[PDB]
Amino acid sequence: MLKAVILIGGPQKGTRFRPLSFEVPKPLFPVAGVPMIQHHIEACAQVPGMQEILLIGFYQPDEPLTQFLEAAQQEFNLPVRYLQEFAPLGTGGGLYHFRDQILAGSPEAFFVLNADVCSDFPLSAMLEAHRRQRHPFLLLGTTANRTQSLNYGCIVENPQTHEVLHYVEKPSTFISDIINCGIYLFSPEALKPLRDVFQRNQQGTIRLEQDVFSALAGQGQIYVHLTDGIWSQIKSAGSALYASRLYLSRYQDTHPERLAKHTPGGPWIRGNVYIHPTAKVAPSAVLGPNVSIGKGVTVGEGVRLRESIVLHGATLQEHTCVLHSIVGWGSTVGRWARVEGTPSDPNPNDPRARMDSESLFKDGKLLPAITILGCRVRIPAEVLILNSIVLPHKELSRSFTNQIIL
Amino acid sequence: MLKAVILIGGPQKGTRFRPLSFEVPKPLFPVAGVPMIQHHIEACAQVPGMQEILLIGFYQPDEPLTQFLEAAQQEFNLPVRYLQEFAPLGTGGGLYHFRDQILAGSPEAFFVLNADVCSDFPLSAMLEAHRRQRHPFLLLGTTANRTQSLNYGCIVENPQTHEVLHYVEKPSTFISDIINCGIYLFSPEALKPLRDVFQRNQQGTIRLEQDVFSALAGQGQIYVHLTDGIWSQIKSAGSALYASRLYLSRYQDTHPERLAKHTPGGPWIRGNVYIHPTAKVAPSAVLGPNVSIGKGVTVGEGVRLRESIVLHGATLQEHTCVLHSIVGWGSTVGRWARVEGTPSDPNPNDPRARMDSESLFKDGKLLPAITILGCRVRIPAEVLILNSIVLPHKELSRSFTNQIIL
Amino acid sequence: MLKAVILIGGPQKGTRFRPLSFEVPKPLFPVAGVPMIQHHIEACAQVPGMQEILLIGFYQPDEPLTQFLEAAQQEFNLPVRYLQEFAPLGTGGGLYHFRDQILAGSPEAFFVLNADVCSDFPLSAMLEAHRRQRHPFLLLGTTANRTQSLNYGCIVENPQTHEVLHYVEKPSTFISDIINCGIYLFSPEALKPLRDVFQRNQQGTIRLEQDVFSALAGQGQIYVHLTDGIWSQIKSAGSALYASRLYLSRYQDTHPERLAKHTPGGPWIRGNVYIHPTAKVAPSAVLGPNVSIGKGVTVGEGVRLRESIVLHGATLQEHTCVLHSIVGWGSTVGRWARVEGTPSDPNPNDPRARMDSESLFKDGKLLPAITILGCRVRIPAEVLILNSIVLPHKELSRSFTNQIIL
Amino acid sequence: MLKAVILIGGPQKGTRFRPLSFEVPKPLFPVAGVPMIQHHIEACAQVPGMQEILLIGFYQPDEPLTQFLEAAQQEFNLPVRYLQEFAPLGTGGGLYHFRDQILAGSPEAFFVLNADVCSDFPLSAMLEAHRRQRHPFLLLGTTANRTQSLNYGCIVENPQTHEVLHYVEKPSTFISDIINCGIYLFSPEALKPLRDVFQRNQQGTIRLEQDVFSALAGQGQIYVHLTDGIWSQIKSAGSALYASRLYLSRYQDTHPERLAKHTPGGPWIRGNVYIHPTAKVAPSAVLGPNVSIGKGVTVGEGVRLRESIVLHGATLQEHTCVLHSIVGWGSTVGRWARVEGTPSDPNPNDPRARMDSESLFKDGKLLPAITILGCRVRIPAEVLILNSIVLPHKELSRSFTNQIIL
Numbered sequence A, B, C, D: 001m002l003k004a005v006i007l008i009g010g011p012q013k014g015t016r017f018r019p020l021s022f023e024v025p026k027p028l029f030p031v032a033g034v035p036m037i038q039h040h041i042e043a044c045a046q047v048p049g050m051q052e053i054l055l056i057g058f059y060q061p062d063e064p065l066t067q068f069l070e071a072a073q074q075e076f077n078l079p080v081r082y083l084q085e086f087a088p089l090g091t092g093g094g095l096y097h098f099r100d101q102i103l104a105g106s107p108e109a110f111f112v113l114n115a116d117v118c119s120d121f122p123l124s125a126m127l128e129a130h131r132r133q134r135h136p137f138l139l140l141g142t143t144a145n146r147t148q149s150l151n152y153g154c155i156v157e158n159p160q161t162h163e164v165l166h167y168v169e170k171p172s173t174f175i176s177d178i179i180n181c182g183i184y185l186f187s188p189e190a191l192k193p194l195r196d197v198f199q200r201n202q203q204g205t206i207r208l209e210q211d212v213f214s215a216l217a218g219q220g221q222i223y224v225h226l227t228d229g230i231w232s233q234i235k236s237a238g239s240a241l242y243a244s245r246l247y248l249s250r251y252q253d254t255h256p257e258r259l260a261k262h263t264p265g266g267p268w269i270r271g272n273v274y275i276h277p278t279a280k281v282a283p284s285a286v287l288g289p290n291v292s293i294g295k296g297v298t299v300g301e302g303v304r305l306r307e308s309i310v311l312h313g314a315t316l317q318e319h320t321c322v323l324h325s326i327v328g329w330g331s332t333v334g335r336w337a338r339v340e341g342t343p344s345d346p347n348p349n350d351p352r353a354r355m356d357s358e359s360l361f362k363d364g365k366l367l368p369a370i371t372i373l374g375c376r377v378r379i380p381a382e383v384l385i386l387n388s389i390v391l392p393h394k395e396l397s398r399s400f401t402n403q404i405i406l
């Protein structure tokens, strides 16, 4: 028997996702058409012997979260429960606080997945490596650039036994090119160190990386499993576009019916395109590489869509060019309008990928990044929105370049 | 019998007020301690013969608006009613749509006040000028700079009869140094041109300046009354600070009990300071010129407060310097933190006052302006927030300069 | 050009609909599968020359109402607008207040339909009778029992000219067996008397029956059109069951694809049954006469359903007998449970049909009527709910007979 | 060091409190002017050595609960924290689930108080009896009638050692006249049996009475402390009136400034009357025994008020007689109206006190009990509401006797 614990965040963790996280929680944001933790629930339900999927977070249970829970329980034939913490307890404090609900039924192991990662999720390879070695902590790690590794949690390991000897969460110097993927496999024995950490706080909030991983490294309890699959961290609102690109590439092997094909009565399609069946796309439109369309989306004639996410209810009128953008829920773009962003991907292999701070700014200047329209944003006709963030329920009247429209 | 129609906006008009308008409507924002339309209701209730005050807007009636209506009806001994439009009808369409509720009881005249202006409100002088001349439209106008007049509605008048011969709402060239103050006195006859405008739209939405004032100028129906009192337009979130400075100057003659004095068991006070009676200020704090404090505000020891608005529930810890800022509701500033903004007063007499567009930006760079903290914003200890806008329910961890923290 | 004004109510008018009106507005309650004003919008869109459908009420625009407006505009290829009044103005005050939006485009006539009636809606016969005679007011009337007519608005007419000579809204004595159906055809001239009524209130709230119909009767302005089709008034929560029965009978001629047929892999079906396509019904269930099933409804094996309405999301477990009941949204009925009500159809032709007051009671005793379960009501296994009203979000544990479970 | 755990319920437990629990949670309902758990927090803050007060329940944290938490932390100079469970875990499951937050700081003992009891709260006598004997469980028990004891949890004890030998929660036969008061004193050792109960459920939800108290009775771990003070159980909405009478009697010794006195410019006062300082009572009114008035309540001239609770914002017009009633928030009673109920105090000493079931009914007939008006209920002039329950936001037009007005 196996279990899966998906550590979704809370409303404070979604503030960096801010113009999209104003209407729906950041875990329920659709990357490549389905919500971002439905990829985790998909991959965990594919593992044989998986009995339960628990979601630990401090979101209050509202209608989108409970509707997603019912839909996931019906779709994947598995109990998907939401354990709500009484306070933000960190990444390890929710695992220690819900230890009786996690260890109920005595599982052999339980996965611990951070909800903001986009991975190919090699849970079966990781599980079998654990079934051979049977250590308390198993980490998923991937190789990164030497400049990019200072953004992520570096893992210094011994290559013979694959045992991590050092862990630094954000080192100022290069210590390792292997970074932590946010996918873990825990033995039941792994809830025994967390307790000790909790007792050291009493002589509540446990950070799993700083208090458990960095402190127990080199003592034979934490081990690494290295993969070469796709991996990304969805932190800001524009990172979901790169995660969408990766997931649409993954759909060529995983869900080939989800990608859209060339149809004689349909639109032109380049690259990997997801179109929802409820969405009505005009045949004169062309939908370029890495485009996701949601339900009830009207796409007019002559619409160019490239590297974009169009959320549900949005309307693009005729001859509208949308590049590197996220078009919010119910937000309408008028005719001959151009919604353009500059490509900015958070990949740990690109040397001049960006350094991914909380600040969207530099020297007063807003950095050129993905154009994000919030929900119910009205873009007028023949108006350019370039490199801009538009907050929800905004009606614009002129062109805006490199701004944050409050 | 006289009436007063205060044209409050709706949720779309308050988007430019965005980080403060996320919790309460822009009409109910407290400038100099009381909400911004309570100044209008104060000045209209002081006029003898004022029977009713109507508020026309397309806000939905929620608990702050109805609570304000009950409090204003109890305080000013007058019926204060809220007429909610079915759609945003512009500045004149709500006056024409509610013509039966405005003309009920057959009033002699009714004032029409835009809710976003800060004025000294000379309604008695304006009323008596109208009682001498009895024209359909009477405008309040003030003198402006030649560079600043292109931001406001310019009025070209004839100086003998005080009759406006030309009206342009935003001219690209200088046409006049007299600008429209957003205070009008309407005769019942003035609802007769608006009807004609409505019929010309059928062969709904009536803009009072573009469709009525500019079109009927020079035909003997619109007349001007010129004042020298205080006037300001509250459009962005930082303009409310300048309106607070003007209203606290007005309080020296109007409400001398509202300004705070030097008390031996109290804080040091420079200039005009409003402190709410519920607020607890430490005696080591000094509160500089043009400072407004709301209810339930804890101000620690050694706190410097200058040119600021501290909204209700906010906590400033010890040795905190706050200059040119608006501290939101329930937002906490830690010890030795510095919340600083750059003074940007929107007055039509200063030649290098700013040009007051929708964009807060220039050339990518955020313009140096008032620091605005949203509601429930936690500022950590020994952290500087300089020239920044922080959106609500944000917990910061480091210093931010010249940014918009989403 | 023709128009249609559907007078939906507000939240005060839906209080008599109380356990069902706690979640959705009373106009959007599904009778025979579609919402109750979608029957009016269906019948008005079938009339040739119908340009617009206006809904006048004092509900605040929330997500169900706006979602219905968008769905109706897409389905019926017609502008369906919602005009929200600033106050409850009665049945005629909303018609007089929105006279400029009603008469916009100069229509030949406009229908006025009360939203709570279930009719066969003979708008074409009524329109053609009006096109022959061209009087200001045309009423739809039907024949009733002599005892039942005291519940409805009686119309004393002259049979040669079909002109009403007397109108009493609720007479204590028998004056007429013709009652008002709540369907009217108005000429533009008919907005001229309403104005006079409004002026008599000033020397706002206009009741169309008491102030206009009873006062102008016999003066040649109000005329009657008599039909023999189906008619019912949906006032209480159990009246919607009888309206569902009538509409499912009407579906045999109007929408024959909406009624469910005998399928070899499907459930047994007696009488007129509506099943939503999303609903999953077990083949061992039998669904008796006048049964409506909503979307996402799981119906177990052996379920008897007769004369019932099962709202969306509800779950009936195995061997559950449900008779004369309304099962709310998401409400679950356990196995071998019996949810039973007593039939009490409100038709004006039955002599011992009930007298339809606000009180559900008599002499302390609750009257035997339709069993209503609110939303998210959990009925446990092997438990009888007989003649009872269960308020929403209630979890029961034992059998309840003839009660109101708060 | 001592702690206090107040087991507030959740939204399902407040359904029996239904017409009052529609607006505010049942723990925050004001009995004798202050909310019902503020009596518990008052009595726990009076105990020396009390460090923390924890509230365990499954209410979601909304604005009334957090506002009460901030007000209680400011008033009683104590940390008052709310621990929200992830699910309804019963009366013992929340104590076992939050065992690390309860035992944090290693307290000597912690009180466990059910939030629905009205007691005199003898925590110091109970604590000192525990400090002499040091047993895991200490119960508060009171003597009841032989007929009434079948409603409560009976305790069969040995009178020499005060050790309970038998516990039955609702016996069909008389077993004991000592009943459980819902006040407990727990040693840290008492969290050790609860764990065993939890493990027996795995081979979550722990009922403290059925699983722990009845099973461990007679084994030397549970002991009784008997008091003679006031005690009541607030289960239905009308039980709060009897708890208000008991607390106003307690105010003669505990808060003598809260009771209202005879004032020459004030109303006549019989018995124990609480009046809020914000409430304006006319001098011609007389306020009889056991009357509680909330803030902002306007009481007209000639108003008789006896055995009543008037919640905040309510308006009683002139010559209005209100007896045995609960007048909701913002609910207005017109002039010469009579709001009357039948006394129904659920005390365990009265032999013909009522048997206190979930059903408010008998044989179809509604039982004569306390008249409850919900929030914003408008009672018209000269109209009698007798023995009736009126659900919130209802506007009545005639007299109602012995009904539930939906």
Ligand SMILES: Nc1nc2c(ncn2[C@@H]2O[C@H](COP(=O)(O)OP(=O)(O)OP(=O)(O)O)[C@@H](O)[C@H]2O)c(=O)[nH]1
Binding pocket: A007, A008, A009, A010, A013, A056, A057, A058, A085, A088, A089, A090, A091, A094, A113, A114, A115, A116, A117, A152, A153, A180, A181, A182, A209, A233
């Ligand atoms: N339940 C719960 N989950 C949390 C909490 N804080 C963060 N998380 C989740 O834990 C995951 C990682 O949290 P972070 O603190 O941002 O760590 P990280 O920056 O992604 O770093 P790595 O895990 O090393 O890749 C995300 O999915 C968060 O949503 C918390 O307080 N409670």
Ligand SMILES: Nc1nc2c(ncn2[C@@H]2O[C@H](COP(=O)(O)OP(=O)(O)OP(=O)(O)O)[C@@H](O)[C@H]2O)c(=O)[nH]1
Binding pocket: B007, B008, B009, B010, B013, B056, B057, B058, B085, B088, B089, B090, B091, B094, B113, B114, B115, B116, B117, B152, B153, B180, B181, B182, B209, B233
């Ligand atoms: N009722 C109503 N009021 C409105 C509407 N639009 C704007 N207002 C109010 O009318 C006033 C002025 O509106 P604006 O269009 O922004 O005009 P302005 O820029 O202030 O220009 P001036 O009036 O010339 O000083 C403000 O108080 C708005 O809140 C509307 O659609 N309906």
Ligand SMILES: Nc1nc2c(ncn2[C@@H]2O[C@H](COP(=O)(O)OP(=O)(O)OP(=O)(O)O)[C@@H](O)[C@H]2O)c(=O)[nH]1
Binding pocket: C007, C008, C009, C010, C013, C056, C057, C058, C085, C088, C089, C090, C091, C094, C113, C114, C115, C116, C117, C152, C153, C180, C181, C182, C209, C233
């Ligand atoms: N817009 C609006 N509609 C209303 C108002 N009051 C009632 N209605 C609607 O008008 C219709 C009839 O209202 P009622 O006052 O209950 O009249 P009735 O009892 O149905 O009587 P008849 O029309 O003669 O059959 C219903 O559809 C109500 O929803 C109102 O104040 N404003």
Ligand SMILES: Nc1nc2c(ncn2[C@@H]2O[C@H](COP(=O)(O)OP(=O)(O)OP(=O)(O)O)[C@@H](O)[C@H]2O)c(=O)[nH]1
Binding pocket: D007, D008, D009, D010, D013, D056, D057, D058, D085, D088, D089, D090, D091, D094, D113, D114, D115, D116, D117, D152, D153, D180, D181, D182, D209, D233
């Ligand atoms: N935290 C929490 N508290 C609960 C729960 N269920 C009930 N309570 C509280 O526990 C107290 C008693 O609950 P009941 O089950 O109704 O027991 P009782 O009928 O009052 O019986 P006695 O305690 O013997 O007097 C009340 O204050 C409830 O609000 C729960 O699931 N979680």
